């Protein structure tokens, strides 16, 4: 029950159904951790859709930042080009 959670993409290791269940019930804006800041490093499409903001990393630098709506508007990376 901490004030910030930083996850290095455990979802990509867990099964997809469990990933969706977690992203809905625990980590998502409607989850049991709603009021707490959450950050992740997964590239899963479902999680990225669940995101409230996103950042694109390029060899130690950043290339883009913004909400999922801005990501979709740009469509500059698979975060929007793959869906």
């Amino acid at each position: 029950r901490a004030d910030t959670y930083l996850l290095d993409d455990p979802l990509a290791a867990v099964d997809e159904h469990v990933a969706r269940h977690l992203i809905e019930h625990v980590l998502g804006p409607n989850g049991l951790l709603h009021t707490k800041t959450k950050v992740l490093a997964t590239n899963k499409v479902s999680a990225l859709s669940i995101a409230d903001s996103i950042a694109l990393l390029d060899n130690g630098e950043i290339t883009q930042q913004g909400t999922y709506d801005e990501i979709t508007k740009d469509a500059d990376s698979p975060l929007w080009k793959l869906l």
């Binding site: 290095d8 590239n43 995101a51 409230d52 996103i54 950042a55 060899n59």
Partner: protein, 118 residues
């Protein structure tokens, strides 16, 4: 021999405490950035020939919101995540993390004991 080994260990390079300001906490529902930095840069070794680094990052997640970092293996996602916790040497820029923190690594760390204990 053992004193030589122990002295090398005790003199090994530590983590710099001021890489991130973990102290702050914000009395707002969802209206504050958790990370703060202009051109934050982090490195894995203070010895030269840096095989890994983070450069000119200005990442900003917000209180109560889920944010994600996108990038293939080696793009620096793990580095950014761990630097948010204070595990990398801030060479240039600024960084901070608000409130109590928690973290889950790529590899699940589990401790011998009860699952309730873990």
């Amino acid at each position: 021999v053992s004193i030589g080994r122990l002295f090398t260990f005790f003199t090994n390079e530590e983590l710099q405490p001021d890489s991130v300001q973990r102290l702050p906490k914000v009395k707002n529902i969802g209206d504050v950035a958790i990370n703060i930095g202009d051109d934050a840069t982090f490195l894995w070794q203070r010895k030269p020939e840096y095989k890994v680094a983070l450069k000119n990052i200005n990442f900003q997640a917000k209180k109560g919101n889920l944010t994600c970092i996108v990038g293939k293996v080696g793009s620096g996602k793990t580095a950014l995540l761990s630097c948010m916790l204070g595990d990398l040497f801030r060479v240039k820029g600024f960084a901070t993390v608000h409130g109590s923190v928690a973290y889950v690594s790529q590899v699940p760390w589990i401790m011998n004991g009860t699952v309730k204990e873990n």
